Amino acid sequence: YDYLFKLLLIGDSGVGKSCLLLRFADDTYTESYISTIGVDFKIRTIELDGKTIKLQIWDYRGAHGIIVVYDVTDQESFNNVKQWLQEIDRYASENVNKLLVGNKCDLTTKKVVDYTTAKEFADSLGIPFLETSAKNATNVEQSFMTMAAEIKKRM
Ligand SMILES: Nc1nc2c(ncn2[C@@H]2O[C@H](COP(=O)(O)OP(=O)(O)O)[C@@H](O)[C@H]2O)c(=O)[nH]1
Ligand SMILES: [Mg+2]
């Protein structure tokens, strides 16, 4: 391994953090209600720019990057991203990497959080922004890859 990157998923309940994490780690997905992923964390290896990188993912101070998830169909969860970053400022290495994720990009009929206005926000904060679908398996890997990229960039 070239690096070990320790990642962390924040966000409101029902956004899909557990779905994303299990999709990404295990390639599983179920509509079924997840109380908990049964295990303290997930481990996953990826290759990137010639570099083999192990990931250790939770669902604060020892995280290299934190992913702040929200739901494109829940405007409530989007507004709360604001709080979820103040948390990061309080309990996290001062330059810990950040990525904003609007899960459930697949529910377009239900989409109330305009991509363009979430993007405009992440930009305003200087953060990368991706829309994902744990259900369809869309952008899920782009997301974690983008996170590695950003961490490997500060180093
Ligand atoms: N349509 C769709 N539904 C999703 C997606 N991700 C999660 N869900 C559903 O939304 C619920 C919330 O997922 P969960 O991962 O437990 O959210 P968490 O509590 O924030 O970790 C689940 O019961 C899923 O069926 C997605 O990408 N697309
Ligand atoms: Mg969960």
Please give the torsion angle defined by the CA atoms of residues 89, 139, 114 and 103, in that order, rounded to the nearest 10 degrees.
Answer: -60
Among all chains, which residue has been given the structure tokens 């990061």? 88
Q: What is the largest CA-CA distance in the chain?
A: 43
Q: What is the resolution of this structure in A?
A: 2.6
Pocket perturbation via mutation, ligand 1, pick of 19, 30, 31, 74 by most ligand atoms within 8 A of CB? 19
Strand order in the sheet with 51-58: 42-48, 51-58, 3-11, 65-71, 97-103, 129-131
Please give the torsion angle defined by the CA atoms of residues 23, 28, 30 and 36, in that order, rounded to the nearest 10 degrees.
Answer: -70
Q: With the C-alpha atoms ordered 73, 140, 126, 80, is the resulting torsion angle positive or negative?
A: positive
Domain covering 1-155 in this structure, CATH number: 3.40.50.300
Q: Which residues are annotated as a binding site?
A: 13-14, 16-19, 31, 36, 59, 103-104, 106, 134-135
Least Cα distance to 106 among 83, 132, 139 occurs for: 132
Least Cα distance to 69 among 100, 42, 96, 97 occurs for: 100
Residues having CB closer than 6 A to ligand 1 are 11, 13-19, 31, 33-34, 103-104, 106-107, 133-135
The runs of H, that is alpha helices, within 5-114 are: 17-26, 75-79, 81-90
Ligand 1: which residue has its CA nearest to atom 24? Answer: 31
Ligand 1: which residue has its CA nearest to atom 22? Answer: 31
Residues with their C more than 2.5 Å from the N of the next written residue in the chain, i.e. before a break, are 59
Strand (E) or helix (H) holding 31 = none
Domain range list for the chain: 1-155
DSSP string, 104-140: -TT-TTT--S-HHHHHHHHHHHT--EEE-BTTTTBSH
Measure the CA–CA gap between 149 and 55, rounded to whole angstroms: 12
16 torsion bin: left (phi>0), alpha (psi -120 to 50), beta (else): left
**Nearest ligand to the CA atom of 19:** 1
Q: Which residues are annotated as a binding site for GTP?
A: 13-14, 16-19, 31, 36, 103-104, 106, 134-135
Token pair listed for 123 = 């930009």
Alpha carbon of 54 to ligand 2 centroid (Å)? 23
